[PDB]
Amino acid sequence: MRLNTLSPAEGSKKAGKRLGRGIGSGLGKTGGRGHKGQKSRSGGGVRR
Amino acid sequence: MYAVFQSGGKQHRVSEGQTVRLEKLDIATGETVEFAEVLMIANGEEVKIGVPFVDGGVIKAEVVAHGRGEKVKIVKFRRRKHYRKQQGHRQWFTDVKITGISA
């Protein structure tokens, strides 16, 4: 085998969610946390 | 000397020898096609108006080319509702060269 022929198993990598990268990306501009409120804020959200 | 006929979901009015672009057919780039359903054949003064698909007359046409048309660009936009979308479209054709209007 070669180093430029190796490849992971199908379903190993999920590539993550990049919040805030445009309209067409699904999430983006609020990044999946809705409009205003304590959960929308940086560091916000109620404790356990 | 012209004929009216239904090719690809719409009527055309073609004369002798002229080349008309219409929808995609299952015809090769170098083959023949026969439009036997002809709606209206006018020759000089004798106009044969077709109570449908008049009588006997069959148009002979040769396929010139098969390319795709110019790209239209669909922009779907909604102001202040956080939604836009683009999509291109290129519609296939066949260019047929009318070889003979049968009377």
């Binding site: - | 055309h12 009015r13 073609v14 008309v20």
Partner: protein, 142 residues
Amino acid sequence: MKTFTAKPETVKRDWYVVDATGKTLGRLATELARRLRGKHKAEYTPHVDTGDYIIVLNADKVAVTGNKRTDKVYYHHTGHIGGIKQATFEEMIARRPERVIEIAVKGMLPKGPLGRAMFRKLKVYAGNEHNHAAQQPQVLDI
């Protein structure tokens, strides 16, 4: 293949005489608007003036039904302090008789530069004589 579009040079416009002696104002004006726009020609085109020049004689002899001889008022504003000037039908028939059919046709024409052009087609006269005999206009009865 594409459609047909008339060109503003190769349109042939005939000249016509209409006599308005004893006719309804609106139905006369409607046929005038029909011919002036070009809704009668087979090569009708919306963006091209394909209408025919119309001479309208006896413009003070046009009639109206009902009480519209005394009751139809013509309002127009001078664009000034508060000057809203009004005139009934009979006083306009007396003073400027041609302007009756002018405003009546001008309301039934399209708006913009083209409607102004096809209103320039219309040549309305109050009298029985006209000076356009050089253009040899046919009689149009309707």
